Amino acid sequence: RAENMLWHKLPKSIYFRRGSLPIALSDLEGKKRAFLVTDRFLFNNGYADDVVALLKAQGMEVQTFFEVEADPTLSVVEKGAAAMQSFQPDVILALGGGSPMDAAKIMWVMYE
Amino acid sequence: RAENMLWHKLPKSIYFRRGSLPIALSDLEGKKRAFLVTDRFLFNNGYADDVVALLKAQGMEVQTFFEVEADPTLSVVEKGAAAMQSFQPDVILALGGGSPMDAAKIMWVMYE
């Protein structure tokens, strides 16, 4: 007979406004390698260009990965993992809605 | 002319119940050196004994510091900093209410 543990834990760091992006990423000093996780629709739009330009702003070796559809598959996850672990990036950029981010996380940890 | 940043940031990890202590500190594996920050009243009570016993539970090189009164002083802060930086602890244990904790923080960073 005994009692339990309940929980409340949060990510440490969050930003929120219009035009956050530049002032949000301003504090990104010497993190050197970067990797993009996104979808080809959004990457197709004039959106990824913005962030890679801001990555050039101090100049990062990056590569866009827009190769996830509506779901994590067990098929993109390993190609993305293999590609980035070929790259050995040191910062991972999750973009978008639903599938792009979490699959990244997964293959992210697969890099670890 | 431009807009600003507002904020919301939190410590990552918190526990909350009755008898948290053992199940809270259970996840404290190989952190090896420990330092106590407390007051001589509370240390005088049968309270510090409990935590140092649980520190022995896997066995930590620790030392109690109960030498702060109702306030940070500019006098205890440096003796505590000097003592711990003689010890080089790697985990700092803040105990109590008001003055004991924050002064620690201060001299904590003075160690850094």
Side-chain angles (χ1 to χ4, degrees):
Chain A
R1 230 305 279 182
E3 104 274 20
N4 313 326
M5 216 14 105
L6 87 149
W7 295 99
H8 159 105
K9 284 167 169 174
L10 258 0
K12 84 165 139 294
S13 59
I14 61 162
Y15 288 70
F16 51 114
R17 242 56 23 154
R18 282 316 293 192
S20 67
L21 267 100
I23 84 153
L25 58 90
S26 311
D27 58 65
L28 265 237
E29 337 343 350
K31 279 67 64 176
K32 184 187 212 150
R33 314 170 69 79
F35 181 75
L36 216 35
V37 176
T38 179
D39 196 4
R40 37 188 97 56
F41 170 71
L42 295 142
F43 161 73
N44 257 358
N45 307 121
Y47 294 142
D49 54 357
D50 311 332
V51 261
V52 18
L54 292 157
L55 280 241
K56 296 313 90 176
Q58 55 307 22
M60 292 300 93
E61 68 275 16
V62 323
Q63 67 275 16
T64 162
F65 195 96
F66 57 84
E67 290 66 13
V68 36
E69 60 359 43
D71 210 47
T73 76
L74 241 114
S75 67
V76 2
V77 297
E78 69 270 52
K79 59 172 147 349
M84 62 97 74
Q85 65 82 30
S86 66
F87 184 84
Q88 319 317 341
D90 83 68
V91 170
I92 302 302
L93 262 272
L95 252 41
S99 296
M101 35 183 139
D102 59 38
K105 296 185 237 199
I106 300 279
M107 41 131 126
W108 173 50
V109 310
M110 291 276 52
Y111 171 54
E112 313 298 341
Chain B
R1 230 305 279 182
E3 104 274 20
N4 313 326
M5 216 14 105
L6 87 149
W7 295 99
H8 160 105
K9 284 167 169 174
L10 258 0
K12 84 165 139 294
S13 59
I14 61 162
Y15 288 70
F16 51 114
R17 242 56 23 154
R18 282 316 293 192
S20 67
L21 267 100
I23 84 153
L25 58 90
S26 311
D27 58 65
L28 265 237
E29 337 343 350
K31 279 67 64 176
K32 184 187 212 150
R33 314 170 69 79
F35 181 75
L36 216 35
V37 176
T38 179
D39 196 4
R40 37 188 97 56
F41 170 71
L42 295 142
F43 161 73
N44 257 358
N45 307 121
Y47 294 142
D49 54 357
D50 311 332
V51 261
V52 18
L54 292 157
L55 280 241
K56 296 313 90 176
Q58 56 306 22
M60 292 300 93
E61 68 275 16
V62 323
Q63 67 275 16
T64 162
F65 195 96
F66 57 84
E67 290 66 13
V68 36
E69 60 359 43
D71 210 47
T73 76
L74 241 114
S75 67
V76 2
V77 297
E78 69 270 52
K79 59 172 147 349
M84 62 97 74
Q85 65 82 30
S86 66
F87 184 84
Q88 319 317 341
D90 83 68
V91 170
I92 301 302
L93 262 272
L95 252 41
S99 296
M101 36 183 139
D102 59 38
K105 296 185 237 199
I106 300 279
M107 41 131 126
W108 173 50
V109 310
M110 291 276 51
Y111 171 54
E112 313 299 341

